[PDB]
Design a protein around this ligand. Structure first.
Ligand code: QG7
Ligand code: QG7
Ligand code: QG7
Ligand code: QG7
Ligand code: CU
Ligand code: CU
Ligand code: CU
Ligand code: CU
Lengths: 123, 123, 123, 123
């Protein structure tokens, strides 16, 4: 079971901080703080993970969303990360993400950025 | 405010059904049922949306996650949709999505599918 | 063989025009004209397709690149489309695309947009 | 001008080898050899890059396509990489990619993988 492996504080290669609790039922809840972009302080996150992953050495699939509104700022956008948790001495959450921002219909072709973040327990 | 616009039952071009409640605080909660892939019946979803979007004609950014485990099936995978809600007579949620499935490290380069779903209130 | 099916003029849902010749060796060459974004008139495109696709009803994989520089404009960016050609009475090229624009290293997390275009022989 | 910077042999984090010539007109031509997946030996690649990039420290946008057919194997698929070249002592091509494989229409929702490769001149 990866409940204990996922729960806690994670850091990605940009210096962002991802604080998460994995519930026994597959829930992810916590906060996200981005070191880049139109963001400051913490934002609510929610997501889901596979709470009964394979036992063949495969990673644990998961995903979560942040909408970039909090009491300080509203960037009219949301990011979803989709990835897998890989436990062990150098545990990692390897993700790809989609950031959609609100646009008019004329500009909707240009409304989604894509990228990739790797999270570790150190740094 | 788009709380009332988002909450309810949505359908995409594959025949999938997305049932969601938008909370006043930006929460998305509900269930998802996929007409394709390794899925049957309903799965828990959670996500976030911008609860104070622009008023200039821009869409409302949002995102949500489904992990594909329920009491019937476990497909060791999770999908996140990232998109914007566009209200009106033919309201729509236009999304792009990432489906990550658990893999070994050797196969992780091939662990994420990408696609796009458009949800409407009819069909 | 889909050489004859692919070669010709295609249109996507934005009003863009894709003019392509499929070579017997798997080459794609032609021009692209975008109805949106920092673009005007025609841009060089090059790409590749599967010149011996399956015969089981599967689509024909292909992809191509446009760099958005021509004699009129330079938008310091490039788009790649990746998709499959599906022949018949309503033939189609269904794609997803990545648009990367030049950025500094500080802004590289935000350098790639993702989207999807569907091309038809009419419109 | 990045013609000289791009032309040559590149390696990504999977052990794949990308051999490319950048033409003065913005053309990319060469061969690709993948260390993973349904691939063996070299495949034709073609693409485009920005031949007059900004001079403000921004990367050089580019993209290319490989269709995974050669004299040995046909994997009925094509990958496009979209990214930017960043010159200097540790030059790099940072990409994201889309791999589409031929599918029936019923399976087309699952026809595209997405990932990210980083290429260097060493390794
Ligand atoms: O920047 C954000 C929110 C923070 C994103 C951080 C990302 S999430 C993925 C990656 N991983 C991280 O840890 N951090 C980064 N949203 C942009 C929304 N704007 C578009 C946009 C796109 C690129 C750069 C700036 N803006 C639209 C807009 C609406 C109102 C005002 C201003 N702008
Ligand atoms: O199919 C699913 C879950 C349902 C996805 C429906 C998508 S979500 C986006 C799109 N929109 C929709 O409404 N529906 C579709 N997960 C695949 C996980 N497997 C890989 C995979 C990839 C493609 C096809 C089948 N499998 C790995 C695996 C682990 C154990 C057993 C079997 N397979
Ligand atoms: O707009 C373009 C080129 C045309 C893209 C058309 C796309 S391709 C996919 C889709 N399908 C189509 O048929 N058309 C659209 N490049 C943007 C580069 N800029 C970022 C950017 C992002 C969004 C909107 C405007 N700019 C950076 C920049 C460098 C210098 C000056 C100005 N800007
Ligand atoms: O594996 C390939 C070609 C090589 C891709 C290497 C990628 S490109 C991006 C990344 N970067 C690299 O340097 N290497 C990797 N195509 C898969 C096509 N098949 C689906 C598929 C998906 C995942 C794994 C295996 N197959 C469909 C199919 C058609 C007929 C027979 C068998 N299979
Ligand atoms: Cu912004
Ligand atoms: Cu599966
Ligand atoms: Cu621009
Ligand atoms: Cu394969």
């Amino acid at each position: 079971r990866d409940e204990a492996g996922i729960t806690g504080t994670w850091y990605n290669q940009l210096g962002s901080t991802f604080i998460v609790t994995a519930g026994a039922d597959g829930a992810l809840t916590g906060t996200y703080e981005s070191a880049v972009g139109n963001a400051e302080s913490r934002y609510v996150l929610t997501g889901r993970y596979d709470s009964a992953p394979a036992t063949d050495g495969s990673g644990t699939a998961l995903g979560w969303t942040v909408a970039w509104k909090n009491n300080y700022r509203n960037a009219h956008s949301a990011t979803t990360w989709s990835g897998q948790y890989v436990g062990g001495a150098q545990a990692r959450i390897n993700t790809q993400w989609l950031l959609t921002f609100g646009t008019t219909e004329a500009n909707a072709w240009a409304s989604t950025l894509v990228g990739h973040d790797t999270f570790t327990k150190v740094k």
